[PDB]
């Protein structure tokens, strides 16, 4: 059980076919739904392009095709942290258990619905003392 | 002064505690954000007992929450009243006891307690004059019964003169959720009788019957059962936070209820409890409260109080009432039922009166009674234990974590010794 | 022209036997969850005691 | 923060894991490409990639490549990790010696490397779930070698196996009584919990409930996936009564040698006749204990019960569970072992079952799954021993095993080990 | 503003330089017509480091392209990004070297090197504060090793203070393209230890296995190998062109990596390198980058770094990150692999951070290492030299250009002397 060398085109299941299918430069990286995935002939008189995985063309700098990494690719810690003390906010990452943001914080309307519901409702303070 | 601290462990203890703080905050007018919104001065008069004072004027409970998995402690913080507790008082592990008493007391629980004993020590040191401790836990679970009983032993060693309360939920055969309940329940009783000053036992079996019949509601859940226990728990310390004609703190209850040191297992109950549709047909008077108080079906224990003799009983009345009514009713019940009261101790009922009734009630009563009928619960639990242990079933878990079968036999002898010693006074005569 | 044999409308390949019932479509289509009922929740849980009235 | 690692080996294991992962993705709302459209309950089965997709915590093993290549070329090619689909070149050809002594030794190193890489990322690893059919060579051989390696490599991590033992009379291969016994030996000393999932029982369940007369393997795998999901839902959904993995076999294993159990699921019903019955909590629990709805072809009426770990999911109430348990106890046709007074471990969850589009089941609001440990399981071992004894009497098919590096005397030793297991089951269940 | 000049010679040096200027122009957003088309202003404040400004606002690189035959520099002009280089910076002869060290270093190199020395002096005096030189060439060829090392000595005679970097492609015995490599490989190495302040060796054999084992691309060409060296070459000066938290120029590397004056031979590496198929399934974090950068199979040299011990290593992190993770991993990898680090020097790793990751990525790491195992590469070349020299094979060409055997004997002596001097620290104990 050793590694073979290139003898067949990248449409058979001979070893090291996965990477060749992943390479978008090859024409074979992009297949048809009706090739395979076909219950019967009369179901569709059609062909449709489906593509094999979602992969960039260059092996290096592969993180391309993500709009987010392109935006923050020229942001510096000084630019990030030292904006202006009128409109700057904390960016540190805390322990998850401390930022739980419990139920009554999620929906504050429940809070004023409460209190009058249970607190300060139907108190009867009576004391049998001589002076009071 | 004379303030107390709260410790809860396990899932069952945490759910009981999470509702008890809800009840107390309502009485003193504390919203879930910790801001006072009451109307009377007496609400803020004795808030030092259960609450601390922080900068900015917010009140925080002095409670310690312990467990070995974050499953239940994540839910209690994400629900209502999750912002009441101090975030640093949450202490928990990462593995879980796995319903194994040996794991929760020898291997994993013993490792964690270094941290939790520090916060408990810090809390009990900063107080002005400590009065005692109180514990809420279940005897049918791993972390609840395992770490819970170990924590009692070490705190007792550091505070020999303080008093301890335990609100324990023992497992009954009719409602069983674990197969190794008899093992760890028996082991928890061994250490509990040695250290805890006062032990109150609760049954999920009895709580269902009360909610089924007395309240006549068809679909109870664990939310409602936790509320029934919560009402009784606040009732015991009611006279400690409000003025009254007769004052009796926790220590006074211990002296007047415990004749002999090893007999400190009580049963509790609450009154009045009436359904929604029948609440307008009742009249709130002392003569009718005492009827529901002594009702054998109203006790929170599966033990039938008429199957033994009351060594002693106590009643804590709340509201506006006359002492002549209270005193004359407790005499009549003793005379009418002299058979059910042991006869070498005269007038074995203690009565206390508090001037502030609970939320929305004209009157309420909390009953704490020490009766010989509690032996039946231990007998039926021990019967399950001896059938399982005679075949050494499920014993490879405990023997695989450092504890041997010598402790299992030793614990059973002490538990059987308690019942034989407890039943002796039922037939004892002067 | 082959479906109507009483062998294509019964015992198909890897499918439940076709029993041609008709359901009430005014309900039953969007998010109906079978079963008997929603274990009808009772009014009042903690306010049976401390009635607030 | 609690994880579990699933190992799939053999064609049966792969073809049941495919359905299991389809069901899990449907439950958690993850598209086949791995993205989520719109809390962190997924963490027990998946792992965040840092930005976007979620990768399942699974590794696939086989020696014959066709089944793996279908995964890599199917509609789920964008979900699995490309280097976690481990495959060989030559099949085991239903030979145990090939997969354990000849060609299975060259890939276990890669498998352990992948498992180590997966586990190093995890922080709260609960245990392992291993899927494999036992009647095949590579399923029995590689499974045995992998269990033996993982035991000594990991120590006290709990391992659960969902094994498909050969059916009494309806079976495919002809030499499978041989290699099943050896793998039984190997797993008995290294696994923590074993589940019986024979094939006739699932066929009868389908025919009686779904009214399906020509079921294919796609239908059978969905039931197993539902069972796994119901078992694991307590790790990832909050409920009124939660139970963890370590709180399974500490309540199901009385003695270390007795850890073979069989499961049932209810309700299993179609949409056409789930509307004429109410599917109450009282009636679903009766079908769970009904012997005919049992996923293993065994008769529970021929033996005592030890412990039943039975799980509820849906909108059940702890009130109603106790009454049903009391009725089951008071019923006379079901008897437990004498030295076990309480025998039920009950769990309740809030998340209702999910139905896969295009499936056969219904979207009911209640479901119960029971894992039962009973003394009746000795019958399958006895019949397998008889079938082995019929063939081995004159060394049939043995030259295929001897010629692949395996010694002659292993069959005998496995025979005495199965005999000892029979003796243990016989002696445990006797009245005290 | 501490700007460097670039000199490339031979076919290999010109090809590396052609690809190198493609990455740099891509990073700065430079049109192949020399026009700036960037997005942020961070790309222009330091553009004078590599590029010169001319009329019309176009930018021209300051590079000198030198060779003995116009074949290769016809292709570099016609290829992509060929319009950047000034036509006045092409210098070439009409004959070529013919894989002969003497011809490129004594006869044809000497008569031509006056012209290339003029353009280098012209560019050097143009800049205000010169930073140093970087040279890309190959030691296995005629005009590369021969004429290249003659220019290296000439510049060091004129600018003795500036730092000199070389990216040398040394021959590898595994893959052979020429039969006379051992002769001219040893000769040029003799002239490097007295002049070059930093030398970073590269093997084509090491590149081929990286592409085959890590990137898993079936049919790589020289364009792919050229790209790997370009990425590492551009990452060295990342902190000199962009703002960061811990800046470090070339001189900070030389001072902080060279314990003794004759131990300036380094091996390089780059991360993260991943196969095209599994690009989305791995998370880019500091723990993952620091694990891969120290992999023995990720280096750019045939030598195995686990057969010796590191003297000093440097890591130049890129992208926005936090320092504590950076500092803790270097300590962690040093403690867990203390067998591979020499003991008489503590904390022999430097960490540098820049806030601008390369285009198309989010983090990147360049590794520069000084390890005792780089001598294994010289042993193989030296062994081949002795076998060929004892029979005096192919020697008549070298002796036919006024070159005598005496400096052949000196070359092998100094080559062996370096290895002996460089291995005696491997087991040296203080
Ligand atoms: N339930 C179920 N069982 C299957 C399935 N596929 C195969 N089996 C069982 O597997 C047994 C034969 O072994 P296979 O799983 O097919 O093959 P293997 O275990 O990989 O061993 P090799 O044949 O050597 O590759 C059959 O008797 C089936 O009972 C399936 O999709 N579902
Ligand atoms: N009153 C009450 N009892 C509970 C609750 N949850 C569980 N129990 C009981 O506690 C027993 C199991 O104890 P368990 O919670 O597992 O203990 P732990 O493992 O130490 O946390 C069961 O028999 C239940 O009947 C609850 O919320 N309220
Ligand atoms: N990495 C890389 N190596 C090259 C390239 N072109 C040639 N080489 C290597 O350089 C060696 C020959 O060097 P050569 O061009 O003859 O040197 P020169 O005669 O001085 O120009 C061969 O072994 C090749 O492997 C290239 O484009 N990239
Ligand atoms: Mg197969």
What does DSSP say about strands B163-170 and B130-138: parallel, antiparallel, or unpaired?
Answer: parallel
Rounded-to-10 torsion of CA B173, B174, B179, B185: -40
CB-CB neighbors (< 8 A) of A117 in chain C? 52
3-state SS, residue B226 = helix
* Owner of token pair 């590496």: E269
Q: Per the structure block, which two tokens stand in for E20?
A: 């190198």
Judge whether E318 and E358 are in contact, CB under 8 Å: yes
The number of angstroms, rounded, from the C-alpha of D162 to the middle of its chain's C-alpha atoms is 2
Q: Which of E7, E9, E12, E95 to mutate to test the pocket of ligand 3 (most atoms within 8 A of CB)?
A: E12
Distance CA B195, CA B135 (A): 12
Secondary structure, 3-state, A112-130? HHCCCCCCCCCCCCCCCCC
| Kind and range of the H or E run holding B424 | helix B405-427
Distance CA D302, CA D322 (A): 26
E297 and E249 in a common domain: no
Give B5's strand partners: B133
B130 and B183 in a common domain: yes
3-state SS, residue B51 = strand
Q: Give the Å distances, CA to CA, from B272 to A74, B275, B282, C30.
A: 71, 10, 10, 47
Tell me whether residues C33 and D352 touch, CB distance under 8 A. Answer: yes
Tell me whether residues D339 and B390 touch, CB distance under 8 A. Answer: yes
How far away is chain C from the Cα of D162, in angstroms, using its nearest Cα?
24
The verdict on whether D404 is a catalytic residue reads: no
E307 within a domain of the structure (yes/no): yes
Secondary structure, 3-state, B112-138? HHHHHHHHHHHHHHHCCCEEEEEEEEE
Q: Per the structure block, which two tokens stand in for D125?
A: 């690893």
Looking at residue B48, what DSSP letter applies? T
Positive or negative: CA dihedral D32, D35, D38, D42: positive
Distance CA B257, CA D184 (A): 62
Q: Give the Å distances, CA to CA, from B168 to B174, B185, E11.
A: 18, 11, 86
Judge whether B215 and B208 are in contact, CB under 8 Å: no
Distance CA D139, CA D137 (A): 5
Chains E and B touch (3+ CB pairs under 8 A): no
Distance CA A38, CA E359 (A): 42
E39 within a domain of the structure (yes/no): yes
Distance CA D60, CA D67 (A): 10
Distance CA E175, CA E181 (A): 12
- Neighbouring C-beta atoms of residue A104, cutoff 10 Å: 19
Chains E and D touch (3+ CB pairs under 8 A): yes
CATH code of the domain covering residue E276 = 3.30.1330.20
Judge whether B137 and B123 are in contact, CB under 8 Å: no
User: Where does residue E114 rank: exposed (0-12), middle (13-18), buried (19+ CB within 10 A)?
Assistant: exposed
Give E172's strand partners: none
Distance CA D367, CA D349 (A): 10
Range of the domain at E300: 265-374
User: Where does residue B129 rank: exposed (0-12), middle (13-18), buried (19+ CB within 10 A)?
Assistant: exposed
User: Catalytic: which of D247, D283, D379, D422?
Assistant: D247
In chain A, % helix, strand, coil (3-state, to 5) comes to: 25, 0, 75
Judge whether D351 and D313 are in contact, CB under 8 Å: yes
Backbone angles phi and psi of E38, in degrees to 5: -80, -175
Which residue in B93, B92, B196, B185 sits closest to B146, CA to CA? B185
Q: Per the structure block, which two tokens stand in for B258?
A: 């415990």
E56 and E163 in a common domain: yes
Beta-carbon contacts of residue D407 (< 8 Å; ≥ 6 apart): none
Ligand 3 closest atom vs CA E72: 21
Distance CA B412, CA B385 (A): 9
- Chain A, window 64-123: residues with a beta carbon less than 8 angstroms from a chain C beta carbon: 117-118, 121-122
What does DSSP say about strands D305-314 and E51-53: parallel, antiparallel, or unpaired?
Answer: unpaired
B248 and B277 in a common domain: no
| Kind and range of the H or E run holding B81 | none
Which residue in D90, D131, D260, D268 sits closest to D188, CA to CA? D260
Q: Give the Å distances, CA to CA, from B212 to A79, B270, B280, E180, E257.
A: 66, 15, 20, 101, 81
Backbone angles phi and psi of E28, in degrees to 5: -90, 0
Judge whether A87 and A81 are in contact, CB under 8 Å: no
Looking at residue B354, what DSSP letter applies? E
B34 touches chain C (CB under 8 A): no
Ligand 1 closest atom vs CA D93: 24
E277 and E241 in a common domain: no
A51 touches chain D (CB under 8 A): no
Of the candidates B233, B256, B279, which is a domain's last residue?
B256
Beta-carbon contacts of residue D167 (< 8 Å; ≥ 6 apart): D198, D199, D200, D297
Q: Give the Å distances, CA to CA, from D358 to C16, C18, C23, D212, D432.
A: 11, 15, 19, 14, 52
B399 within a domain of the structure (yes/no): no
Any idea which ligand is nearest the CA of D94?
Answer: 1
Peptide bond before B189: cis, by omega within 30 degrees of 0? no
E172 and E153 in a common domain: yes
CB-CB neighbors (< 8 A) of B207 in chain C? none
Backbone angles phi and psi of A14, in degrees to 5: -70, 145
C44 touches chain A (CB under 8 A): no
Chains C and B touch (3+ CB pairs under 8 A): yes
B61 and B149 in a common domain: yes
Tell me whether residues D255 and B396 touch, CB distance under 8 A. Answer: yes
Secondary structure, 3-state, chain E? CCEEEEEEEHHHHHHHHHHHHHHHHHHCCECCCCCECCCCHHHCCCHHHCEEECHHHCEEECEEEEECCCHHHHHHHHCCCCCCCCHHHEEECCCCCCCCHHHHHHHHHHHHHHHHHHHHHHHHHHCCCEEEEEEEEECCCHHHHHHHHHHHHHHHHHCCCCEEEEEEECCCCCCCCCCCHHHHHHHHHHCCCCCCCEEEEECHHHHHHHHHHHHCCCCCCHHHHHHHHHHHHHHHCHHHHCCCCECCCHHHHHHHHCCCCCCCEEEEEEECCCCCCCCCCCCCCHHHHHHHHCCHHHECCCCCHHHCCEEEEEEEEECCCCHHHHHHHHHHHHHHCHHHECCCCCCCEEEEEECCCCCCCCCEEEEEEEEHHHHHHHHHHHHHHHHHHHCCCCCHHHHCCCCCCHHHHHHHHHHHHHHHHHHCCCCCCC
Tell me how many degrees the CA angle E30-E33-E34 measures, rounded to the nearest 5: 45
Judge whether A61 and E360 are in contact, CB under 8 Å: yes
Distance CA E213, CA E299 (A): 13
Give residue B400 CA to ligand 2 midpoint distance, Å: 25
Distance CA E231, CA E300 (A): 12
CB-CB neighbors (< 8 A) of C51 in chain A? 122
Looking at residue A14, what DSSP letter applies? -
How far away is chain C from the Cα of A129, in angstroms, using its nearest Cα?
26
* Owner of token pair 């004209």: B362
Q: How many CA atoms lie within 13 A of B126 on its CB side?
A: 13
Distance CA D261, CA D295 (A): 11
Residue nearest to atom 16 of ligand 2 (CA): B141
3-state SS, residue B310 = strand
Q: Give the Å distances, CA to CA, from E366 to D269, E255, E289.
A: 61, 18, 10
Of the candidates E192, E226, E256, which is a domain's last residue?
E256
Give E165's strand partners: E134, E198
Q: Per the structure block, which two tokens stand in for B72?
A: 């239940």
The number of folded domains in chain B is: 2
Tell me how many degrees the CA angle B221-B222-B224 measures, rounded to the nearest 5: 70
Beta-carbon contacts of residue D60 (< 8 Å; ≥ 6 apart): D8, D14, D17, D68, D71, D80, D84, D85, D86, D87
CB-CB neighbors (< 8 A) of A15 in chain E? none
How many residue contacts between A and D have a Cβ separation below 8 Å? 18
Which residue in B184, B88, B70 sits closest to B138, CA to CA? B184
Give residue D10 CA to ligand 1 midpoint distance, Å: 7
Q: How many CA atoms lie within 13 A of D230 on its CB side?
A: 29
What does DSSP say about strands E310-318 and E364-371: parallel, antiparallel, or unpaired?
Answer: antiparallel
Ligand 2 closest atom vs CA B229: 1
Of the candidates B191, B222, B256, which is a domain's last residue?
B256
E278 and E216 in a common domain: no
3-state SS, residue B179 = coil
Tell me how many degrees the CA angle A121-A122-A124 measures, rounded to the nearest 5: 130
- Neighbouring C-beta atoms of residue A130, cutoff 10 Å: 4
- Neighbouring C-beta atoms of residue B137, cutoff 10 Å: 32
How far away is chain C from the Cα of B158, in angstroms, using its nearest Cα?
39
Judge whether E49 and E4 are in contact, CB under 8 Å: yes
* Owner of token pair 């686990």: E306
Distance CA A49, CA B65 (A): 59
Q: Give the Å distances, CA to CA, from E239 to A42, E24, E330.
A: 64, 14, 19
Q: Per the structure block, which two tokens stand in for D43?
A: 């963490």
Which residue in D427, D408, D422 sits closest to D182, CA to CA? D408
D314 backbone φψ class: left, alpha, beta (φ>0; ψ -120 to 50): left
B192 within a domain of the structure (yes/no): yes
Looking at residue B373, what DSSP letter applies? G
Across B326-361, b (16+ Cβ under 10 Å) vs e yields beebbeebbeeeeebbbeeeeebbbbbbbbbbbbbb
Q: Per the structure block, which two tokens stand in for B252?
A: 């006074």
Looking at residue B106, what DSSP letter applies? I
E29 and E126 in a common domain: yes
Tell me whether residues B221 and D307 touch, CB distance under 8 A. Answer: no
Tell me how many degrees the CA angle E160-E162-E166 measures, rounded to the nearest 5: 105
Separation of first and last alpha carbons in chain D:
45
Backbone angles phi and psi of D231, in degrees to 5: -65, -40
Backbone angles phi and psi of B48, in degrees to 5: -70, -15
Out of E43, E277, E320, the one facing A18 most closely (by C-beta) is E277
**Contact residues of ligand 3, CB 6 A cut-off:** E 10-12, 15, 97, 99, 138, 140-144, 169, 177, 204, 222, 225-226
Angle between helices D410-428 and D176-188 (to 10 degrees): 60
Measured in angstroms, the resolution is 3.7
Beta-carbon contacts of residue B93 (< 8 Å; ≥ 6 apart): B67, B68, B69, B108, B112
Q: How many CA atoms lie within 13 A of E97 on its CB side?
A: 28
3-state SS, residue B256 = helix
Distance CA E307, CA D68 (A): 39
Distance CA D37, CA E355 (A): 32
**Contact residues of ligand 2, CB 6 A cut-off:** B 10-12, 15, 99, 138, 140-144, 169, 171, 177, 204, 222, 225-226
- Neighbouring C-beta atoms of residue D155, cutoff 10 Å: 7
Positive or negative: CA dihedral B254, B257, B260, B265: negative
Helices within chain A (DSSP H only): 18-22, 67-71, 77-81, 103-106, 109-113
Q: Per the structure block, which two tokens stand in for B103?
A: 């794991």
Tell me how many degrees the CA angle D347-D352-D358 measures, rounded to the nearest 5: 135
B291 and B177 in a common domain: no
B280 within a domain of the structure (yes/no): yes
E390 within a domain of the structure (yes/no): no
Beta-carbon contacts of residue B165 (< 8 Å; ≥ 6 apart): B132, B133, B134, B135, B196, B197, B198, B200, B236, B250
3-state SS, residue B58 = coil
Backbone angles phi and psi of B28, in degrees to 5: -90, 5
E243 and E295 in a common domain: no
D82 touches chain A (CB under 8 A): yes
How was it solved?
cryo-EM
How far away is chain A from the Cα of E258, in angstroms, using its nearest Cα?
31
CB-CB neighbors (< 8 A) of A120 in chain B? 29, 37-39
Secondary structure, 3-state, chain D? CEEEEEEEECHHHHHHHHHHHHHHHHHHCCCCCCCCCCCCHHHHCEEECCCCCEEECEEEEECCCHHHHHHHHCCCCCCCCHHHEEECCCCCCCCHHHHHHHCHHHCHHHHHHHHHHHHHHCCEEEEEEEEEECCCHHHHHHHHHHHHHHHHHHCCCEEEEEEECCCCCCCCCCCHHHHHHHHHHHHHCCCCEEEECCHHHHHHHHHHHHCCCCCCHHHHHHHHHHHHHHHHHHHCCCCCECCCCHHHHCCCCCCCCCCEEEEEEECCCCCCCCCCCCCCHHHHHHHHHCHHHECCCCCHHHCCEEEEEEEEEECCCHHHHHHHHHHHHHCCCCCECCCCCCCEEEEEECCCCCCCCCCCCCCCCEEEEEEEEEHHHHHHHHHHHHHHHHHHCCCCCCHHHHCCCCCCCHHHHHHHHHHHHHHHHHHHCCCC
CATH code of the domain covering residue B229 = 3.40.50.1440
Distance CA E15, CA E35 (A): 23
E338 backbone φψ class: left, alpha, beta (φ>0; ψ -120 to 50): alpha
Distance CA B329, CA B352 (A): 13
E369 within a domain of the structure (yes/no): yes
3-state SS, residue B388 = helix
* B204 annotated among ligand-binding-site residues: yes
Beta-carbon contacts of residue E319 (< 8 Å; ≥ 6 apart): E354, E355, E356, E357, E361, E362, E363, E364
Q: Per the structure block, which two tokens stand in for E101?
A: 């060290």
How far away is chain C from the Cα of A121, in angstroms, using its nearest Cα?
7
Distance CA E104, CA D43 (A): 65
- A partners (3+ CB pairs within 8 A) are B, C, D, E
In chain B, % helix, strand, coil (3-state, to 5) comes to: 45, 20, 35
E325 and E220 in a common domain: no
Beta-carbon contacts of residue B172 (< 8 Å; ≥ 6 apart): B203, B204, B205, B302, B377
Positive or negative: CA dihedral D245, D250, D254, D255: positive
B384 within a domain of the structure (yes/no): no
Beta-carbon contacts of residue E87 (< 8 Å; ≥ 6 apart): none
Out of A98, A103, A124, the one facing B357 most closely (by C-beta) is A124
Which residue in D280, D295, D240 sits closest to D365, CA to CA? D280
3-state SS, residue B307 = helix
Which residue in D371, D422, D373, D415 sits closest to D390, CA to CA? D415
What does DSSP say about strands E51-53 and E59-61: parallel, antiparallel, or unpaired?
Answer: antiparallel
Secondary structure, 3-state, E63-87? EEEEECCCHHHHHHHHCCCCCCCCH
3-state SS, residue A108 = coil
CB-CB neighbors (< 8 A) of A6 in chain E? 218-219
Judge whether E240 and E49 are in contact, CB under 8 Å: yes
């Amino acid at each position: 059980t050793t590694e073979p060398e290139k003898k067949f085109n990248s449409t058979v299941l001979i070893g090291n076919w996965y990477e060749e299918r992943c390479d978008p430069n090859r024409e074979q990286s992009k297949f048809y739904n009706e090739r395979k995935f076909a219950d019967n002939n009369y179901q569709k008189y059609t062909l449709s392009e489906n593509k094999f995985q979602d992969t960039s063309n260059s092996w290096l700098n592969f993180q391309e095709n993500k709009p987010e990494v392109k935006n923050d690719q020229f942001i510096t810690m000084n630019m990030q942290e030292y904006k202006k003390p009128s409109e700057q906010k904390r960016n540190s990452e805390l322990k998850p258990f401390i930022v739980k943001k419990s139920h009554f914080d999620k929906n504050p309307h429940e809070l004023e619905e409460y209190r009058e519901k249970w607190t300060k409702s139907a108190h009867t303070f009576d004391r049998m003392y001589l002076g009071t | 002064m004379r303030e107390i601290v709260h410790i809860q462990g396990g899932q069952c203890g945490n759910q009981i505690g999470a509702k008890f703080w809800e009840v107390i905050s309502d009485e003193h007018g504390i919203d879930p954000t910790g801001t006072y919104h009451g109307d009377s001065d007496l609400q803020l008069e004795r808030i030092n007992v259960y609450y601390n004072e922080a900068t900015g004027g917010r009140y925080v409970p002095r409670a310690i929450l312990m467990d070995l998995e974050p499953g239940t402690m994540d839910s209690v913080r994400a629900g209502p009243f999750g912002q009441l507790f101090r975030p640093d008082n949450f202490v928990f592990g990462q593995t879980g006891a796995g319903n194994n008493w040996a794991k929760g007391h020898y291997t994993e629980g013993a490792e964690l307690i270094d941290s939790v004993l520090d916060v408990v020590r810090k809390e009990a040191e900063g107080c002005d004059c400590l009065q005692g401790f109180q514990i809420t836990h279940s005897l049918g679970g791993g972390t609840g019964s395992g770490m819970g009983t170990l924590l009692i032993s070490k705190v007792r060693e550091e505070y020999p003169d303080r008093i301890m309360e335990t609100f324990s939920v023992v497992p009954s055969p009719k409602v069983s959720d674990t197969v190794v309940e008899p093992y760890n329940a028996t082991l928890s009783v061994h250490q509990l009788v040695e250290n805890a000053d006062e032990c109150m036992v609760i049954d999920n079996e009895a709580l269902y019957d009360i909610c089924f019949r007395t309240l006549k509601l068809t679909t109870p859940t664990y939310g409602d059962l936790n509320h029934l226990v919560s009402a009784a728990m606040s009732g015991v310390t009611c006279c400690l936070r409000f003025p009254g004609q007769l004052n009796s703190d926790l220590r006074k209850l211990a002296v007047n209820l415990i004749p002999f040191p090893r007999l400190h297992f009580f049963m509790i109950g609450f009154a009045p409890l009436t359904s929604r549709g029948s609440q307008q047909y009742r009249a709130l008077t002392v003569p009718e409260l005492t009827q529901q108080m002594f009702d054998a079906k109203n006790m929170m224990c599966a033990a039938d109080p008429r199957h033994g003799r009351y060594l002693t009983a106590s009643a804590l009345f709340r509201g506006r009432m006359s002492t002549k009514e209270v005193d004359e009713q407790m005499l009549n019940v003793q005379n009418k039922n002299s058979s059910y009261f042991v006869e070498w101790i005269p007038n074995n009922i203690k009565s206390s009166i508090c001037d502030i009734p609970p939320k929305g009630l004209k009157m309420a009563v909390t009953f704490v009674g020490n009766s010989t009928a509690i032996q039946e619960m231990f007998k039926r639990v021990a019967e399950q234990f001896t059938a399982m242990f005679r075949r050494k079933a499920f014993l490879h878990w405990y023997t695989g974590e450092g504890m041997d079968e010598m402790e299992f036999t030793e614990a059973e002898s002490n538990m059987n010794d308690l019942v034989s010693e407890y039943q002796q006074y039922q037939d004892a005569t002067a | 022209k082959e479906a109507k044999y009483h062998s294509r409308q019964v015992e198909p390949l890897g499918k439940r036997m076709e029993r041609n019932y008709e359901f009430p479509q005014e309900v039953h289509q969007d998010n109906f969850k079978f079963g008997v009922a929603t274990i009808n929740s009772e009014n009042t849980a903690k306010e049976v005691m401390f009635p607030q009235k | 923060m609690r994880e579990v690692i699933s190992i799939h080996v053999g064609q049966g294991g792969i073809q049941v894991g495919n359905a299991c992962w389809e069901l899990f993705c449907l439950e958690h709302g993850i598209q086949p490409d791995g993205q989520m459209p719109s809390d962190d309950a997924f963490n027990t089965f998946f792992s965040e990639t840092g930005a976007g997709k979620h990768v399942p915590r699974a590794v696939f093993l086989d020696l014959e490549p066709t089944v793996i290549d279908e995964v890599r070329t199917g509609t789920y090619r964008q979900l699995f990790h490309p280097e976690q689909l481990i495959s060989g070149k030559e099949d085991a050809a239903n030979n145990f010696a090939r997969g354990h002594y000849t060609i299975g030794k060259e890939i276990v190193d890669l498998c352990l490397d992948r498992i180590r890489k997966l586990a190093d990322n995890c922080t709260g690893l609960q245990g392992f779930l291993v899927f494999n059919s036992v009647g095949g060579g590579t399923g029995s051989g590689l499974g045995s070698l992998l269990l033996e390696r993982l035991s000594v490599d990991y120590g006290k991590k709990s391992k659960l196996g969902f094994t498909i033992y050969p059916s009494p009379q309806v079976s495919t291969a002809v030499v499978e009584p041989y290699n099943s016994i050896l793998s039984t030996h190997s797993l008995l000393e290294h696994t923590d919990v074993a589940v019986m999932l024979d094939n006739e029982a699932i066929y009868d369940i389908c025919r009686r409930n779904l009214d399906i007369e020509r079921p294919t393997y796609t239908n059978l795998n969905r039931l197993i996936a539902q069972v796994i999901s119901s078992l694991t839902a307590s790790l990832r959904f909050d409920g009124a009564l939660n139970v963890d993995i370590t709180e399974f076999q500490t309540n199901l294993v009385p003695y270390p040698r007795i850890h073979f159990m069989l499961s049932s699921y209810a309700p299993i019903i179609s949409a056409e006749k789930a509307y004429h019955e109410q599917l109450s909590v009282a009636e679903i629990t009766n079908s769970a204990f009904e012997p005919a709805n049992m996923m293993a072809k065994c008769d529970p009426r021929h033996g005592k019960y030890m412990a039943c770990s039975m799980m509820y999911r849906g909108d059940v109430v702890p009130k109603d569970v106790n009454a049903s348990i009391a009725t089951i106890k008071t019923k006379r046709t079901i008897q437990f072992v004498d030295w076990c007074p309480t025998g039920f471990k009950v769990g309740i969850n809030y998340q209702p079952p999910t139905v896969v589009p295009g499936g056969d089941l219904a979207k009911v609001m209640r479901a119960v799954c029971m894992i039962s440990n009973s003394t009746a399981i000795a019958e399958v071992f006895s019949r397998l021993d008889h079938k082995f004894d019929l063939m081995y009497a004159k060394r049939a098919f043995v030259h295929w095993y001897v010629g692949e590096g395996m010694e002659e005397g292993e069959f005998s030793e496995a025979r005495e080990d199965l005999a000892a297991l029979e003796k243990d089951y016989e002696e445990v269940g006797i009245e005290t």
